[PDB]
A paper describes a structure:
The examples shown in the Methods section ascertain that SeU can be successfully and conveniently used as a practical and easily applicable vehicle for phasing novel crystal structures of macromolecules by the SAD (or MAD) approach through the anomalous signal of selenium. The use of SeU as a provider of anomalous signal for the SAD phasing has been examined on crystals of several proteins and a nucleic acid.
On the other hand, the Se atom in the central selenocarbonyl moiety of SeU may accept hydrogen bonds from various donors, provided by amides, hydroxyl groups and protonated amines. The high concentrations of urea are routinely used for denaturation of proteins, but no adverse effects were observed after relatively short exposure of protein crystals to SeU.
Author numbering: 59 to 87, 99 to 326
Write the structure that this text describes.
Amino acid sequence: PPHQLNHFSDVANKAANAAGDVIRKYFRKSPVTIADQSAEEAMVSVILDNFPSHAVYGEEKGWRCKQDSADYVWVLDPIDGTKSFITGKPLFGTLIALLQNGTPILGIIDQPVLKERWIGITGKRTTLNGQEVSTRTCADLSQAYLYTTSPHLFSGDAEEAFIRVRDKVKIPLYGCDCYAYALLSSGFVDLVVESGLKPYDFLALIPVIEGSGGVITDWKGHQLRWEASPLSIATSFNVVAAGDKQIHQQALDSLQW
């Protein structure tokens, strides 16, 4: 297992703290691009000051590393949910993931306006603001509360797949971004289904959801993996996350991907 997780947490939390400071000045005062750049720059200042050998892939400026390669890769998105940010809606989030040879070992979802921070760590239960959180059981897809960001954020076949699961759930809801994954981790949402998600908007979710007892994969039900390198391309993935493995299963059958 990894031995440096507490030290990784402290820098993780400082990165997140520094992103928050930038984000709160620009939220509700184009501010979004200044915010997104400054915030990313703030996080890499912290991460690279504490670990010079480490690499980062940020949503604004891609890969950045001194060395040829690194065993440790920081995948960042300061504002996951730019449309929410632009419209004054405080459900966007800063996402921080640390990858050890391509496996995520830490993830943060921070909401700096709501002052809510979910940390996921390998081999620990996921916490929200220092308190342990847990997904909830849910019998059947008909009992499930579902979130997706948008309906026409699906093209052609993805929209058919999505419709199939949509018709079976208790109620489909829209318009959290990453917050919906935070909510599911805390046991308030049963299922999140999305298409066209870039790595810096899902890698942080994995330890958060998994350490809460939930499951998150692609539409085929495979492990969400993205090996970040200097020669890495941020390509779209499809994501299904559930509080309950039975629900995940059942969702996978409706997706027919």
